[PDB]
Coordinates of C-alpha atoms and ligand atoms in Angstrom, one line a residue:
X1 CA -187.5 -12.3 -69.9
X2 CA -185.3 -10.6 -72.6
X3 CA -182.4 -11.4 -74.9
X4 CA -179.9 -11.1 -72.0
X5 CA -181.7 -13.4 -69.6
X6 CA -182.4 -15.8 -72.5
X7 CA -178.8 -16.1 -73.7
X8 CA -177.6 -16.3 -70.0
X9 CA -179.8 -19.5 -69.7
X10 CA -178.5 -20.9 -73.0
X11 CA -174.8 -20.0 -72.6
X12 CA -174.3 -20.3 -68.9
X13 CA -171.5 -18.3 -67.1
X14 CA -167.9 -19.6 -66.7
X15 CA -165.1 -17.3 -65.5
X16 CA -162.2 -19.4 -66.7
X17 CA -161.3 -20.4 -70.3
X18 CA -163.4 -23.4 -71.4
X19 CA -164.3 -25.1 -74.6
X20 CA -167.7 -24.5 -76.2
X21 CA -170.0 -27.2 -77.7
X22 CA -167.9 -27.2 -80.9
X23 CA -164.6 -27.5 -79.0
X24 CA -163.6 -23.8 -79.3
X25 CA -162.0 -21.8 -76.5
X26 CA -164.6 -19.5 -74.9
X27 CA -165.1 -17.5 -71.7
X28 CA -167.8 -15.8 -69.7
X29 CA -171.3 -16.0 -71.2
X30 CA -170.5 -17.7 -74.5
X31 CA -167.8 -15.3 -75.6
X32 CA -165.9 -17.1 -78.3
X33 CA -162.2 -16.4 -78.0
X34 CA -160.8 -18.2 -81.1
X35 CA -161.3 -21.2 -83.3
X36 CA -157.5 -22.0 -82.9
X37 CA -156.5 -25.1 -81.0
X38 CA -153.8 -23.1 -79.2
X39 CA -154.7 -22.2 -75.6
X40 CA -152.0 -19.5 -75.8
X41 CA -153.8 -18.0 -78.8
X42 CA -157.0 -18.0 -76.7
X43 CA -155.3 -16.3 -73.8
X44 CA -154.0 -13.6 -76.1
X45 CA -157.5 -13.0 -77.5
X46 CA -158.9 -12.8 -73.9
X47 CA -156.3 -10.2 -72.9
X48 CA -157.0 -8.2 -76.0
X49 CA -160.8 -8.4 -75.3
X50 CA -160.5 -7.4 -71.6
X51 CA -157.6 -5.0 -71.9
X52 CA -155.3 -6.6 -69.3
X53 CA -153.0 -9.6 -68.8
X54 CA -155.6 -12.1 -67.4
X55 CA -154.0 -15.6 -67.7
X56 CA -157.3 -17.2 -68.5
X57 CA -159.5 -15.9 -65.7
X58 CA -161.9 -13.0 -65.6
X59 CA -164.4 -11.5 -63.1
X60 CA -168.2 -11.7 -63.3
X61 CA -168.3 -7.9 -64.1
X62 CA -165.8 -8.4 -66.9
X63 CA -167.9 -11.4 -68.3
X64 CA -171.1 -9.3 -68.3
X65 CA -169.3 -6.4 -70.0
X66 CA -168.2 -8.7 -72.9
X67 CA -171.7 -10.2 -72.9
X68 CA -173.3 -6.8 -73.4
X69 CA -170.9 -6.0 -76.2
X70 CA -171.5 -9.4 -77.9
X71 CA -175.3 -8.9 -77.8
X72 CA -175.0 -5.4 -79.1
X73 CA -172.6 -6.6 -81.9
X74 CA -175.0 -9.4 -82.9
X75 CA -178.0 -7.0 -83.3
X76 CA -175.8 -4.4 -85.1
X77 CA -174.6 -7.3 -87.5
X78 CA -178.2 -8.3 -88.2
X79 CA -179.2 -4.7 -89.1
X80 CA -176.2 -4.5 -91.5
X81 CA -177.0 -7.8 -93.2
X82 CA -179.3 -7.4 -96.3
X83 CA -180.5 -11.0 -96.0
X84 CA -181.4 -10.7 -92.2
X85 CA -182.6 -7.1 -91.7
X86 CA -186.0 -7.5 -93.5
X87 CA -187.0 -10.7 -91.5
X88 CA -185.7 -9.2 -88.2
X89 CA -187.7 -6.0 -88.9
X90 CA -190.8 -8.0 -89.6
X91 CA -190.8 -9.7 -86.2
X92 CA -192.2 -8.8 -82.8
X93 CA -189.7 -8.3 -80.0
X94 CA -189.9 -11.8 -78.5
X95 CA -189.1 -13.4 -81.9
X96 CA -186.4 -10.8 -82.5
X97 CA -184.7 -12.2 -79.3
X98 CA -184.8 -15.7 -80.9
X99 CA -183.2 -14.3 -84.0
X100 CA -180.4 -12.6 -82.0
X101 CA -179.9 -15.9 -80.1
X102 CA -179.2 -17.8 -83.3
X103 CA -176.7 -15.1 -84.6
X104 CA -175.0 -15.0 -81.2
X105 CA -174.5 -18.8 -81.4
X106 CA -173.6 -19.4 -85.0
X107 CA -172.8 -15.9 -86.5
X108 CA -174.0 -14.6 -89.8
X109 CA -172.0 -17.2 -91.8
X110 CA -173.7 -19.9 -89.7
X111 CA -177.2 -18.5 -90.6
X112 CA -176.5 -18.2 -94.4
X113 CA -178.3 -21.6 -95.1
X114 CA -181.5 -20.5 -93.3
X115 CA -182.8 -18.7 -96.3
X116 CA -186.0 -20.8 -96.5
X117 CA -186.6 -20.6 -92.7
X118 CA -186.2 -16.8 -93.0
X119 CA -188.8 -16.6 -95.7
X120 CA -191.3 -18.6 -93.7
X121 CA -190.6 -16.5 -90.6
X122 CA -191.2 -13.3 -92.6
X123 CA -194.4 -14.8 -94.0
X124 CA -195.4 -15.6 -90.3
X125 CA -195.9 -19.3 -91.1
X126 CA -194.8 -20.2 -87.6
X127 CA -195.4 -24.0 -87.6
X128 CA -193.8 -24.4 -91.1
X129 CA -190.9 -22.2 -90.1
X130 CA -190.4 -24.3 -86.9
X131 CA -190.3 -27.6 -88.9
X132 CA -187.8 -26.1 -91.4
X133 CA -185.5 -24.7 -88.6
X134 CA -185.2 -28.2 -87.1
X135 CA -183.8 -29.6 -90.4
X136 CA -180.3 -28.3 -89.7
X137 CA -176.9 -29.2 -88.3
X138 CA -177.8 -26.6 -85.6
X139 CA -180.8 -28.6 -84.3
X140 CA -178.9 -31.9 -84.5
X141 CA -175.8 -30.7 -82.6
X142 CA -177.6 -28.6 -80.0
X143 CA -181.2 -30.0 -79.9
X144 CA -182.3 -28.8 -76.4
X145 CA -181.2 -25.2 -77.1
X146 CA -182.5 -25.3 -80.7
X147 CA -185.9 -26.5 -79.4
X148 CA -186.2 -23.6 -77.0
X149 CA -185.2 -21.1 -79.7
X150 CA -187.6 -22.8 -82.2
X151 CA -190.5 -22.7 -79.7
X152 CA -189.9 -19.0 -79.2
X153 CA -190.2 -18.5 -83.0
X154 CA -193.2 -20.8 -83.1
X155 CA -195.2 -19.2 -80.3
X156 CA -193.8 -15.6 -79.8
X157 CA -193.8 -16.4 -76.1
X158 CA -191.1 -17.1 -73.4
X159 CA -192.8 -20.4 -72.5
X160 CA -189.6 -22.5 -73.4
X161 CA -187.6 -20.5 -70.8
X162 CA -190.1 -20.6 -67.9
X163 CA -188.9 -23.0 -65.2
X164 CA -185.3 -22.3 -66.2
Ligands
LIG1 F1 -181.5 -12.4 -88.2 C1 -182.1 -13.6 -88.2 C2 -183.5 -13.6 -88.1 F2 -184.2 -12.4 -88.1 C3 -184.2 -14.8 -88.1 F3 -185.5 -14.8 -88.0 C4 -183.5 -16.0 -88.1 F4 -184.1 -17.2 -88.0 C5 -182.1 -16.0 -88.1 F5 -181.4 -17.1 -88.1 C6 -181.4 -14.8 -88.2 F6 -180.1 -14.8 -88.2
LIG2 CL1 -157.2 -21.1 -68.1

């Protein structure tokens, strides 16, 4: 297991424009297109992302290409964020994947309220961190995925992704 296989499980793969858990137009492996309610606006973003006139449908190769870029961009974002870099640097590689997972799903604006969780993770207070992480809109709206990500932070293992 690694961040790519992990996010592939959590995000799935769909080759036509679909709406994510929040109702936003998305494609491929959790590639958010736009928060706009306009499908035409989504299609435009898709064409710009892929570099061709797609009309809402992409190939598996194209989806994986966007996916690699999105994972790369999430990591690069963490490393450029003063509030996230120290915690991320303090973690082992399995828990780093869990961190990248959260940023991929909610962005850096989404993780701004996790200040206390982040402190507990940097302190390696894994059970306490896990309890704090669950006290969130994130956990309530996507409990099954949050539980997997939280178990990864708690244990530093891939146990929550075995069987899947
Ligand atoms: F970068 C992050 C981390 F290193 C974390 F450990 C974490 F919980 C987050 F939500 C992050 F965005
Ligand atoms: Cl479509």
